[PDB]
Design a protein around this ligand. Sequence first.
Ligand SMILES: CC(C)(COP(=O)(O)OP(=O)(O)OC[C@H]1O[C@@H](n2cnc3c(N)ncnc32)[C@H](O)[C@@H]1OP(=O)(O)O)[C@@H](O)C(=O)NCCC(=O)NCCS
Ligand SMILES: CC(C)(COP(=O)(O)OP(=O)(O)OC[C@H]1O[C@@H](n2cnc3c(N)ncnc32)[C@H](O)[C@@H]1OP(=O)(O)O)[C@@H](O)C(=O)NCCC(=O)NCCS
Ligand SMILES: CN[C@@H]1[C@@H](O)[C@@H](O[C@@H]2[C@@H](O)[C@H](O[C@H]3OC(CN)=CC[C@H]3N)[C@@H](N)C[C@H]2N)OC[C@]1(C)O
Ligand SMILES: CN[C@@H]1[C@@H](O)[C@@H](O[C@@H]2[C@@H](O)[C@H](O[C@H]3OC(CN)=CC[C@H]3N)[C@@H](N)C[C@H]2N)OC[C@]1(C)O
Lengths: 154, 154
Amino acid sequence: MGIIRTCRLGPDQVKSMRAALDLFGREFGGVATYSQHQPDSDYLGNLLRSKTFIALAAFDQEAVVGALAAYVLPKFEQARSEIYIYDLAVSGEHRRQGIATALINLLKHEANALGAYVIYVQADYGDDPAVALYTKLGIREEVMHFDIDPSTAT
Amino acid sequence: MGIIRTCRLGPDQVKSMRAALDLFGREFGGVATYSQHQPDSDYLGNLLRSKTFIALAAFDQEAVVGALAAYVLPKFEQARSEIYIYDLAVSGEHRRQGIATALINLLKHEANALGAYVIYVQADYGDDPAVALYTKLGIREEVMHFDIDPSTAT
Ligand SMILES: CC(C)(COP(=O)(O)OP(=O)(O)OC[C@H]1O[C@@H](n2cnc3c(N)ncnc32)[C@H](O)[C@@H]1OP(=O)(O)O)[C@@H](O)C(=O)NCCC(=O)NCCS
Ligand SMILES: CC(C)(COP(=O)(O)OP(=O)(O)OC[C@H]1O[C@@H](n2cnc3c(N)ncnc32)[C@H](O)[C@@H]1OP(=O)(O)O)[C@@H](O)C(=O)NCCC(=O)NCCS
Ligand SMILES: CN[C@@H]1[C@@H](O)[C@@H](O[C@@H]2[C@@H](O)[C@H](O[C@H]3OC(CN)=CC[C@H]3N)[C@@H](N)C[C@H]2N)OC[C@]1(C)O
Ligand SMILES: CN[C@@H]1[C@@H](O)[C@@H](O[C@@H]2[C@@H](O)[C@H](O[C@H]3OC(CN)=CC[C@H]3N)[C@@H](N)C[C@H]2N)OC[C@]1(C)O
């Protein structure tokens, strides 16, 4: 065991996508957010069918032990793409084994296939594993982010 | 004059989109990035046709004096959407007149129409106007961001 295989999920792999989401739940400690109100199978299908969403999964045999959810941003200034890693998680029982790194690597192959010139991801202050991983793999910038409630539309 | 009208651009408005991009160029001081290698009309059409890209523009009569480029992120954990402001600019000759605010407001109407529960935007340290605008309009978080070269795929 410990034969890890990485792939980009298609619309035929809703079962594996749901397992990625539970992984996300367990590992982000948001079991409710990620497992208890999942979309219907059509919704996931439509995600997985799309050219601008990428779901990557790592399998130790049958179980999903790593996943990565990204979005492709076709840019408007020029005919070029950027990729935005939204979420990335490896099973606690499978860390420091290169799975995250391999999913990013896989992601780079998808990017190359798409002609996307860059991939980016955001990390939180204190998320030290994530910060190390992306610092090893990327160029860091510190920035601000703001949420806005659309409720207040006038 | 100074009658400003805000709208979400459709695929019939490639001419106005190109003007948004020049605005972006002039105002971000990236005239090359934004004006000199624009996509072909089809590419823009396809952007403007899409349900997951939003281009908002403000017009003082015929000229574009404000624009906003966002992406809709249909989420995977749950059947819900988030909106990501990528770029936002108001003509230097038209600032502090509520145009940015009105484009965001417009954006909130689009979000509501989409069922999207939040909108977010990133700002740079020292971009004081932007920081004030989003601080007035949003809840700030400080975070890191990392670019990764897909070139190194192995
Ligand atoms: C971060 C996470 C994905 C790491 O996955 P991983 O497979 O263990 O990472 P890899 O083993 O492929 O590579 C780890 C590399 O990143 C860094 N790193 C990973 N875990 C680390 C840790 N615990 N402490 C310090 N650095 C760490 C190191 O550079 C390491 O390279 P090295 O072992 O040669 O020094 C996982 O532990 C996790 O908690 N996921 C959720 C975190 C997250 O970012 N969520 C929000 C979405 S981005
Ligand atoms: C930031 C920018 C969009 C402002 O547009 P604007 O129409 O002038 O903003 P509005 O007039 O609608 O509202 C401005 C509000 O934000 C803040 N603000 C705007 N300009 C400001 C400035 N120069 N200094 C301080 N605060 C400022 C204030 O809260 C103000 O509210 P108030 O006048 O009641 O105090 C524009 O000046 C610009 O430079 N665009 C590019 C910046 C950018 O963010 N680019 C990267 C993509 S996010
Ligand atoms: C509340 N505001 C939000 C803002 O936090 C941001 O969320 C980022 C998101 O991509 C990823 O979140 C995951 O990671 C972690 C640990 N870091 C916990 C929860 C996970 N989902 C991650 N790459 C970094 C996040 N900052 O954008 C969306 C938002 C709504 O604005
Ligand atoms: C180089 N790394 C990049 C990283 O900077 C980030 O760019 C953000 C982008 O949305 C918007 O940029 C605009 O604003 C400004 C002034 N702030 C200058 C150039 C404009 N295009 C803005 N909201 C904040 C940016 N930080 O993401 C993409 C990226 C490739 O990773």
